Amino acid sequence: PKEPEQLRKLFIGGLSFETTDESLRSHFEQWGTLTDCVVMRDPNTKRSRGFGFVTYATVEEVDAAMNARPHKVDGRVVEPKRAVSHLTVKKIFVGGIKEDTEEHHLRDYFEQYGKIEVIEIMTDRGSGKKRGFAFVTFDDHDSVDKIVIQKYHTVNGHNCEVRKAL
């Protein structure tokens, strides 16, 4: 069946106050079927709150929209982010990699989530031995958001624990 609706949503910040449900939909329908699309407004004045959300039919459509950033909607570059599972970071902790996992193992796996800028395999300050964890820094937060919602990460045969790093 369908992926959970929460994983199909994009929170769009930085909207022009002139953006409407209809203009937000017309824009974001370029990357998939929208089952929902709302501009948040004040309950009394109806003036835009400057943000809204869109819900796609599939996760692949969310990916397509994110890959099409930057989005200029009604003349203003907006800020789409996947729904919270927002702590917006570009770096992950990767644990459980033991002593045999190398840079290329992490690169070959994680490069399919986003563009990697730094891989830091952690070693012991005294002995230089690998400590069994690493940090990966990407050029953009959506890579991290995609990573941390997965139930599982398998790298170099290890089932890894992956979390946002700050």
Ligand X SMILES: CC(C)N(C)S(=O)(=O)N1CCO[C@H](C)C1
Residue ranges that bind ligand X, judged by CB under 6 A:
93, 95, 133, 163, 165
Residues 6 or more apart from 69 whose CB is under 8 A from it? 80
Q: Label the pairing between strands 34-41 and 9-13.
A: unpaired
| Shortest reach from residue 22's CB to ligand X, in Å | 42
Beta carbons within 10 angstroms of residue 97's beta carbon: 23
| Shortest reach from residue 79's CB to ligand X, in Å | 24
- Name which of 69 and 163 has its Cβ closer to ligand X: 163
| Shortest reach from residue 114's CB to ligand X, in Å | 18
- Name which of 25 and 91 has its Cβ closer to ligand X: 91
Q: List the one residue out of 116, 124, 122, 126 whose CA is nearest residue 102.
A: 122
- Name which of 93 and 109 has its Cβ closer to ligand X: 93
DSSP H stretches of helix in 31-98: 59-67
d(CA 84, CA 118): 25
| Shortest reach from residue 135's CB to ligand X, in Å | 8
- Name which of 21 and 120 has its Cβ closer to ligand X: 120
d(CA 138, CA 94): 13
| Shortest reach from residue 32's CB to ligand X, in Å | 32
- Name which of 25 and 131 has its Cβ closer to ligand X: 131
d(CA 70, CA 126): 45
